[PDB]
């Protein structure tokens, strides 16, 4: 509708990744979420929206998918977790750890 091939690549990224963090390189919230997953020994796919060509168009399409306008924007095992606050809440509640343990198939 905006960019059909971009929409498709973003979805494919989420579908194939145990964790995908849509981030910005300089953002301390992004930095904080990355550190959380690193502490848990979890490898993540990170897409730095400030470092991709047409990152504005990517954020726009990503808001269409997720109904969220801010970064960071976190998916775990294909489930939208949300922003930094929601990810730390998921950590505190046990949600994050249970989502991370679920069996899934990751292509590549
Ligand atoms: Cl650009």
Swiss-Prot record:
Origin superkingdom: Eukaryota
Subcellular location: Cytoplasm; Nucleus; Microsome; Endoplasmic reticulum
Domain Glutaredoxin: 7-107
Annotated family: Belongs to the class-I pyridine nucleotide-disulfide oxidoreductase family.
Assembly notes: Homodimer.
Function: Displays thioredoxin reductase, glutaredoxin and glutathione reductase activities. Catalyzes disulfide bond isomerization. Promotes disulfide bond formation between GPX4 and various sperm proteins and may play a role in sperm maturation by promoting formation of sperm structural components.
Domain statement: The N-terminal glutaredoxin domain does not contain the C-X-X-C redox-active motif normally found in glutaredoxins but activity may be mediated through a single cysteine. The C-terminal Cys-Sec motif of one subunit of the homodimer may transfer electrons from the thiol-disulfide center to the glutaredoxin domain of the other subunit.
Miscellaneous field: The thioredoxin reductase active site is a redox-active disulfide bond. The selenocysteine residue is also essential for catalytic activity.
Protein name: Thioredoxin reductase 3
Taxonomic source organism: Homo sapiens
Encoding gene per record: TXNRD3
Range covered out of full length: 51 to 156 of 643
